Amino acid sequence: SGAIYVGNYRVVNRHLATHNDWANLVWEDSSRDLLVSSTTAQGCDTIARCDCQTGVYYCSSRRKHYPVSFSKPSLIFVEASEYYPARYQSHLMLAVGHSEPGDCGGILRCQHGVVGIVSTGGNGLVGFADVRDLLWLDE
């Protein structure tokens, strides 16, 4: 679990969105595993606007942050799950690192701010849903 709080927006994994997130829906994209809902309180985070390929992510299954090298946002085949059929997930960045299903929502950050959130993983891999292209989050 985990979310990004920027301005009056809350960004979460679409598969983990609550009834309240859907009741206050701003935007969602099943192909990216992202959902954005509106909030009444001002958010704590800054979004990176960069092309960094190194950063640090929080891994809740180890209670630790790990430094990673990650690929550029791209279309990656993701296996079938309880929430989605076998499909290509877009704007996904892969890295070598530990992750478990419950790590989804852990934030990936670089020196410029929030890059994305954990969305996929397996066998010593971790995938992050990019948010740097969502310029409207800053206004």
Ligand X SMILES: COc1cccc(Cl)c1CC(=O)N1C[C@H](C(N)=O)C[C@H](C(=O)NC2CC2)C1
Q: Establish whether 50 is an annotated binding residue.
A: yes
**Can you say whether the dihedral through the CA atoms of 103, 107, 118, 21 is positive or negative?**
positive
**Among 26, 29, 31, 84, contact with ligand X (rule: CB under 6 A):** 84
By CB under 6 A, tell whether 139 contacts ligand X.
Answer: no
Q: How far is the CB of 132 from Zn ion (least distance, A)?
A: 8
Task: Transcribe 74-103 into DSSP letters.
Answer: EEEEE---SSS-SEEEEEEEEEES---GGG
On the CB side of 79, how many CA atoms lie within 13 Å of its CA?
A: 4
With contacts defined by CB under 6 A, name the span among 22-30, 39-47, 51-59, 75-83 that binds ligand X.
75-83
In the complex with ligand X, the residue whose CB is nearer, 50 or 125, is 125
Q: In the annotation, is 33 catalytic?
A: yes
